[PDB]
Structure formats: C-alpha cells, structure tokens
Amino acid sequence: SFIDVFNGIYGFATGIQDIFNMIFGTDTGDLTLEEVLKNQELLYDISGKLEGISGDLSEIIAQGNLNTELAKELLKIANEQNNVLTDVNNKLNAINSMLHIYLPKITNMLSDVMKQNYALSLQIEYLSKQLQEISDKLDVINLNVLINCTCTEITPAYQRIKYVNEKFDELTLATEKTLRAIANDTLENLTELTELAKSVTKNDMDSFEFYLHTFHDVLIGNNLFGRSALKTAAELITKDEIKTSGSEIGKVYSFLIVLTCLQAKAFLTLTACRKLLGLSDIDYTNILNQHLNDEKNVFRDNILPTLSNKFSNPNYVKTIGSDNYAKVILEAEPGYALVGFEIINDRIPVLKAYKAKLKQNYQVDHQSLSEIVYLDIDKLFCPKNSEQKYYTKSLTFPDGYVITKITFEKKLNNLRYEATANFYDPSTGDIDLNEKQVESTFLQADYISINVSDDDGVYMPLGVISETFLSPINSFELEVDEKSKILTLTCKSYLREYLLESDLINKETSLIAPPNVFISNIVENWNIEADNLEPWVANNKNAYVDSTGGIEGSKALFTQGDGEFSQFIGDKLKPNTDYIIQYTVKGKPAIYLKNKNTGYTMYEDTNGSSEEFQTIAVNYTSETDPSQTHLVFKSQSGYEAWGDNFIILECKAFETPEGPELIKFDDWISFGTTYIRDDVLTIDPSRGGYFRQSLKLDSYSTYNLSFSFSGLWAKVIIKNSHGVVLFEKVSQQSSYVDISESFTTTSNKEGFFIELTGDSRGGFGSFRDFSMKEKF
C-alpha cells in the first residue's frame, strides 16, 4: 500500500502477547519432552530384554519333551512373561503415539511463531535502517568516550540476546524447510533446536533469562554503581550534529524501539523454547510489560523533555540552479496539514511534500496521506550566472498551530518564502480554517547574497526533510550561511506530543515512516515485485519478467523481440496536466504511451543505449482528454532490453506570469493646458499643465517601462505626493529618442503616479507608446 505504518512499542508488545496466547493454545500434555524420551528409552531397554528372555524360553520350551506337568508350568510361566512383555510394549506404543502426535503440533506452532515474528519484525526494518544511518554518520573518532560508556555494560546482554534470537530464527527456518521438503526423523531434525531450547531455558546462573533481566537493568540503571544506558546513548546521539533524517526525538525513539523490540523477540524466543521442550507454561507477559513500561517511562521522563524537535535536511548536493521566475506552493486542502518533505536528485531534482489529515493529538492519518511533486527544485534555490538574494526568517508559529501552506517565490533572484499555519485544537483533531496565522518574508529588506561563480554551485539540501515518522510541523525556515554556500531546510515537528499521548502512556499508536516510494504515481505495480501482475500484460512469451535482471534483485521486465509489456493507465491520466515519466533501464529499450483506438505515440523514446542500468526522467503532457492510454515497454527489434521502476507522477509546476499592464491610455488625467489628439498627448510647457496616472506598483518589484520621448526637456517623474521619486528622465535631443529603462519599487506600495511636465519654457512635448510591465 506504499505506506509502512508503525504501530509503536505498545503495538509490538500487543503482537508479542498475541503470539504468547497462540503458543499457550497448543496443549503438549503433562510430560516434558525429555521425560518422554527417558521413559521411551527405559521402556525400550526393558522390552528388548524381556523379548530376549521370552524368545529363549520359547525356544527351550518347544524343543524337549518337557513331560506333562513341567510343560504346563513352563507354558504358564511363558504366558505370564508374555503378558508382562505385552504390557511393556503397550506402554511403549502409547509413548510412541504420544510423541507422534506431539511433534507435528510443535512443528506447526514453531512455523506459526516464525511467521508472526517475521510479520512483527517487518515493522522495525525502517527503524533498524535509521539506526544504521545514525551509526554511520556518527562522529565516533571523538565520541569514543561516550560510545564506550553506553556499550560497555549492555554489550554482553545485547550479544547474547541477538545470538539467541538469530539462532532460533535460523533453526526454525531450517526445520520448516525440512518439514516442507516419522517421529524419529522429526527428532533428528529438531535435535539442534531442542538443544538451543535447553540452553536458553536452563534455569541456572548466567542463563538467557539472566541476560534478559540485566539488559533491562542496564537500560534503566537500577544499580547505583552503573549508569542508565538509555540516557547515555541519548546523550551520545543528540550531542554534536548527526545529519540524518528526523530530529533528536526521532533518533532516540528509534534506538529505544530497536532495544524494546529486541527484548520482546527475546521473550518470545524464551516462551517458544519453553513450549518446545514441554516445560511448564509461565506467562512472561507481566514481566515483559514491566520492562517495556519502565524503559518507556525513563525515556519519557528523563530523556524526551530535554530533546529537540528540530530536524534539517540529511545532506547537500552542489548544484547550479537557474534564473527568472520560479514559484512553488506546498498548499494543503482544508483539513490537511504538511507532515514532511523530500528532495530527490537522481535524474531531475524533485520536491515531494506530504500532506495528510490529522486524527487528534497530532496523529497523521495514513488513509488520507497524499503527496505533491514539484519539478526542477534546483532552479528555485540556486542561481545560474548571477547573484541570488535570500530573504530568510524562522517562520515559527505558536504551539497548537499546524503549517498548511508553504510558498516559495524566486523573482529576479529574490527568494522570498511565506508560510501559513491553521489552528489545530488537538483535543479533537479538527484543523480550523478560520483561525490562521501567516509568517511571511515578502516584505523583508535585509537579505543574504550568494554569487554562483560558475562551477562554485550552491549546496542545495537533499534527502528527507522530515521527522523519523511523519508529523505536523509548526516552524519552517531556510538557513543560508553565505560562506560555504549551503542551504538548509530546518523544521520543527510535533512528534513529542503524539508520543506523550499515544505510545508513552500505552495507547494505540499509528506512526508513518516517510515513504521512499512515490505514492502518487499512477502506474500500478511500478516496481515488479508483486506476483500475478494484473496491470502488466505480455502480448506473447517473447518478453517476460527477470527475477534478477533488474535493480539489485528487482524482477525487471525483460523484452527480447516483438514482445512488449502493456499497462492500461488511461483512467488515472488527468487531461491538461503535466507528468513526470521516470524509469531505470538497461540496454536499448523503447517506451510509448499508446491510446488504444487509433494507436498514436504521445510519448516515445525509440533510442537510448546503455550496457548498465541508468535512470531516465522526462516530462509529458496529456491534452485532448485521453481516458484511454496504456504504457508500452518494448525492446529494439534486434536488441535486448530491461526495464524497471516505471513511475508516472502527476507533477505540478508554475510558469512565468505575463504581468498586468499597469499604465493605460484611457485613464490619463490632465491638468492645465494639455492637448490630447489621437495617440498623442501634447504637454504645453511654460503654461501650468501636466499629465498624471495612478499606478498599482507592488513592493520590492521591478517594472520595465517603454517610452517615446519628444519635446525639449520633457520631464518624466514616477513619484508620489510625499516626495519619493523612483524614475526620472530628462530629454536632451528630443527628435525621436525612445527609452525603455526599468525601475524598482522597494517598499512604497501605494498610488504612485507618473507626472509628465517640461523644464524648458518651449519644446511642446508629445508622449505615446506607454507600457509598464513587471519583470519576472
């Protein structure tokens, strides 16, 4: 569903409890497996000896004469001995039947435990990736003092727990594979797993339970000698700067989740091993819940309030942008809020802004999660061959406000951005539309100037600008250093409140990891991993799906000859809308967008050769309401092609506005002696007279004005009644001279007027060709 929703530590504990209840449902009887085997071997030895004795008695009783009374007595003794032997054999057969019905139940329980454990562990894969990224980005060269304080007491217990969990998973997988591919062979297959169960369930000193308890003890710091591992790990992570996704809250929470889920898996392994041996069922639900609650309380009361909810971009990429107008609007619909952003630079830089509804206590609703994709984000943050001025401000809003719309405007290399935040009322989760605040830099005067200097491109932010889990933001800003030409997108999240109200008090939790996959792409099964592909269809067997001929291990579509892969996507293709077509290909492929009836190639590659996989991203437009258009991927007629990651994003972009004509011809006001004839406004000097016309000039705006000069010393002044003059020109050789200069209005947005008068007593001036347009 493209969304990896995380159910929280409480959800993981609830899943572990469910697996515990499933384990306890399997009744293994009243005898330990070791006791059953001991009884079986004892009865087997006794039965063998008695069989030998009975055979000897039978072979010595059927040989001699044995008289009459002696024969009867020996027959009676043999009958009694055979009765004893049959009783022993009946007991042995009962033991064998009990074992033969006990083993399949154990194997089924182990398979179910492995399946549910894998299902639960699928949630923490993202958190493990985040922790690995934090570790890689950690500046361990000077932080060895702290890293040897946290991983000095937790290391033995951590190693034991990880080894036990991994070995249990490996052995369970091996047993499942063996069973998929009777009692004696089952025991021979499960001997290693039973040995592991005996090792972990041995109620002895320095047992698995001992390390399980000391793990929690080191995490909390019950002993006065030691220090809490969670607190020192949080200090290690939060200190200095770790340029990864999410804030300090998210990183420390991910570390806590990793440790908590490790403990939960360890307890699950212990319970499964206890059930495997047939030991007494002791419910570890209470102790596991106690450990998890203690750790969450420590994190909530001694770590979380001191953490910062500020997250920046993961890294930077040195790029050269562009110039001229560039407007992006990260607007969210009423009832929605922005929860994160992502800047990806693989083929064409893109900006993904995630917007979603809220479900009380700053909870992001995965049902309504959507994204907006903006193309060419590099042209907005960086210049090409000029100097760009950034008007930056920390657009911080009061607590309780959620940012809905963020607007960036780059006009004449003046990057001014504004944000709007609506009231949230977390008690009900209703984003009020009437109550809102606007924090804008459109009227700022101070700026930071950066010169591109050709190859010295600006470091555009790159990566996921979001918390470890999607959450509303109440503060957004762009930071410019002006020394190394580094731009940083810095935001403040609301994850602390949702953690305090959902997961740290043992309630329902729904955390959404920032998707690494475009969730708004209309190509169903964009990457071919799902089996029984319904959208993808092959015209014949010429083209198939290679399970390893793609990116990493992706099952890429391989085309060889006339075969091709078609997918009908005409239903989701909106008319008159820009789209981004991106795909990773190998060889010489060809991608078309057919329209079923009257087959025409709206988009076509028909070329492109590469011995390795490369990513191609292009722009596309659908104009005449297709409503029937299928993507077709096909190799060259004499070549082999591989294709994967076919994504068609409904992009949004803004062009350069034309700009309204501020000055006109029919609204000229005239005072004194002025003669208006056709396209000529003769102004009479000496005699008191002048032409004027009000203007709608904006703030910090540059306007190009065309003019036709005539008449000696024809004064032109674009000014205000207060005495502020922005554009003044005097004609010197006024035969047919024309001027098309430009003027900038910094901050005096009002009814500016252009006055046309004369300096010389004579020289009847004539004016025409009026056109004042804002430049972008």
mmCIF file with all atom_site columns, C-alpha atoms in Angstrom, residues 2-6 126-127 354 369 466-470 511-516:
data_model
loop_
_atom_site.group_PDB
_atom_site.id
_atom_site.type_symbol
_atom_site.label_atom_id
_atom_site.label_alt_id
_atom_site.label_comp_id
_atom_site.label_asym_id
_atom_site.label_entity_id
_atom_site.label_seq_id
_atom_site.pdbx_PDB_ins_code
_atom_site.Cartn_x
_atom_site.Cartn_y
_atom_site.Cartn_z
_atom_site.occupancy
_atom_site.B_iso_or_equiv
_atom_site.pdbx_formal_charge
_atom_site.auth_seq_id
_atom_site.auth_comp_id
_atom_site.auth_asym_id
_atom_site.auth_atom_id
_atom_site.pdbx_PDB_model_num
ATOM 1  C CA . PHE A 1 2   ? 3.198  2.102  -0.230 1.00 0.00 ? 2   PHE A CA 1
ATOM 2  C CA . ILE A 1 3   ? 2.756  3.124  3.442  1.00 0.00 ? 3   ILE A CA 1
ATOM 3  C CA . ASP A 1 4   ? 4.826  1.488  6.193  1.00 0.00 ? 4   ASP A CA 1
ATOM 4  C CA . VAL A 1 5   ? 2.685  2.275  9.226  1.00 0.00 ? 5   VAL A CA 1
ATOM 5  C CA . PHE A 1 6   ? 4.424  1.584  12.541 1.00 0.00 ? 6   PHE A CA 1
ATOM 6  C CA . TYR A 1 126 ? 12.848 1.082  8.836  1.00 0.00 ? 126 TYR A CA 1
ATOM 7  C CA . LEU A 1 127 ? 13.968 1.813  12.398 1.00 0.00 ? 127 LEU A CA 1
ATOM 8  C CA . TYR A 1 354 ? 3.485  15.144 2.096  1.00 0.00 ? 354 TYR A CA 1
ATOM 9  C CA . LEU A 1 369 ? -1.873 10.586 3.195  1.00 0.00 ? 369 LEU A CA 1
ATOM 10 C CA . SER A 1 466 ? 11.012 15.061 7.844  1.00 0.00 ? 466 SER A CA 1
ATOM 11 C CA . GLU A 1 467 ? 10.828 13.555 11.297 1.00 0.00 ? 467 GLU A CA 1
ATOM 12 C CA . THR A 1 468 ? 11.596 9.856  11.726 1.00 0.00 ? 468 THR A CA 1
ATOM 13 C CA . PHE A 1 469 ? 7.819  9.488  11.416 1.00 0.00 ? 469 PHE A CA 1
ATOM 14 C CA . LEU A 1 470 ? 5.541  11.863 9.537  1.00 0.00 ? 470 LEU A CA 1
ATOM 15 C CA . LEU A 1 511 ? 3.337  6.203  13.117 1.00 0.00 ? 511 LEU A CA 1
ATOM 16 C CA . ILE A 1 512 ? 4.022  6.601  9.393  1.00 0.00 ? 512 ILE A CA 1
ATOM 17 C CA . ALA A 1 513 ? 7.581  6.335  8.142  1.00 0.00 ? 513 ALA A CA 1
ATOM 18 C CA . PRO A 1 514 ? 8.414  8.809  5.349  1.00 0.00 ? 514 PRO A CA 1
ATOM 19 C CA . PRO A 1 515 ? 7.809  6.822  2.157  1.00 0.00 ? 515 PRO A CA 1
ATOM 20 C CA . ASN A 1 516 ? 10.792 6.106  -0.075 1.00 0.00 ? 516 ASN A CA 1
#
